[PDB]
Amino acid sequence: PEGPELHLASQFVNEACRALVFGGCVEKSSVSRNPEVPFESSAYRISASARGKELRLILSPLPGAQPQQEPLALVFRFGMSGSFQLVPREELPRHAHLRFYTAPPGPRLALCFVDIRRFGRWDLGGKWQPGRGPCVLQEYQQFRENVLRNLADKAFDRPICEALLDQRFFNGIGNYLRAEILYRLKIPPFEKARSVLEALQNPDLLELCHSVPKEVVQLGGRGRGEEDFAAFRAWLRCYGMPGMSSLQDRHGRTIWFQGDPGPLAP
DNA sequence: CGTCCAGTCTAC
DNA sequence: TAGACCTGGACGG
């Protein structure tokens, strides 16, 4: 999951939890090496916001709930397979590693953080990850200025296809968005990042870093349904597609592209 | 049965 | 940098 999936996950949590009251504890699987959430409340609501490739849940006790409690914020990273699901309390999916339980009256549900591969992480404290740059979806102007003001950073010595994964500057861009972004402008993936970025000191590369992921968000989904899956595969122009070339960057990750690999190709 | 493929994080 | 962390779904034999 990339920025769009984190964003759609946060919309899922806000819409699905809008009229639910949670109660009790926050239960973690025995196999998850992530920390226990020390939170109990007889009546609380769950809300979410995304920033880049991170999501923040707020656990908000209702007036009078017991035990007394201040709101608790948790921040999640999804790694390669994370997602949120609202399931019936006795029909936990496999790999549901953190669980929030609806209070009565009404059907007993569980909001679940599901993570097949367990590369996902959560931290106590509502803080965004120090060092992550602004959200390409929700903080576009800050995102743009943070890149153009820091082209001296040795980050921009690297191929543009590698620079685009650096979450210090492109918080929310992953392996599918970098292919899709570079394909829209036919920028060779192994062009030097500083070359492509100095040259903008109709839409440019930093605009597409925002407008391309925004397109995915506008498809709908909930972190991505088995028909909204078809919508996504059809939107894709480059990542995985017949007729496209592919190489490994210096971190063994696969960049998809058409035409010139570019000057810094291995 | 087997291999290969699909975002960080951290010990050299 | 190269492993490391994980599971499962495509395939190949």
Numbering used by the authors: 2 to 202, 222 to 244, 249 to 290
The authors write:
Human endonuclease VIII-like 1 (hNEIL1) is a bifunctional DNA glycosylase of the Fpg/Nei family, which catalyzes the removal of damaged bases and subsequent incision of the newly generated abasic sites. Unlike traditional enzymes which are commonly referred to as highly specific biocatalysts, one special feature for hNEIL1 is its unique capability to recognize a wide range of substrates, including formamidopyrimidines, hydantoin lesions, oxidized, and dihydro-modified pyrimidine bases, derived from all four canonical bases. Here, by integrating structural, computational, and biochemical investigations, we show that hNEIL1 uses a triage mechanism to achieve broad specificity and reduce futile repair of normal bases. This mechanism involves two mutually competing interaction states: an activated state that commits catalysis and BER, and a quarantine state that temporarily separates and prevents the flipped base from catalysis via auto-inhibition.
We synthesized a 2′-fluoro-substituted stable mimic of DHU (FDHU), which allows binding but not catalysis by hNEIL1. As a further test of the proposed mechanism, we also sought to “rescue” the activated state by mutating the lesion-recognition loop. Because a nearby positively charged amino acid side chain is important for catalysis, we attempted to introduce a charged residue in close proximity to the flipped base. Considering that Y244 is able to closely contact the base in the quarantine state, we envisioned that replacing Y244 with a positively charged residue might re-establish an active-state-like interaction between the mutated residue 244 and the flipped base, thus possibly rescuing the catalysis activity. To our delight, introduction of Y244R to hNEIL1(R242A) or hNEIL1(R242H) mutant resulted in both mutants to restore their glycosylase activity; in fact, we even found comparable or higher activity for hNEIL1(R242A, Y244R) and hNEIL1(R242H, Y244R) than the wild-type hNEIL1 for DHU and Tg. We further solved the crystal structure of hNEIL1(Y244R) bound to FDHU, and found that although the loop remains at the 244-in conformation, Arg244 forms a key hydrogen bond to the flipped base, recapitulating the key interaction in the activated state rather than the quarantine state. For instance, based on our mechanistic understanding, we rationally introduced an Arginine mutation to the 244 position of the catalytically incompetent hNEIL1(R242H) and hNEIL1(R242A) mutants, thereby creating new gain-of-function mutants.
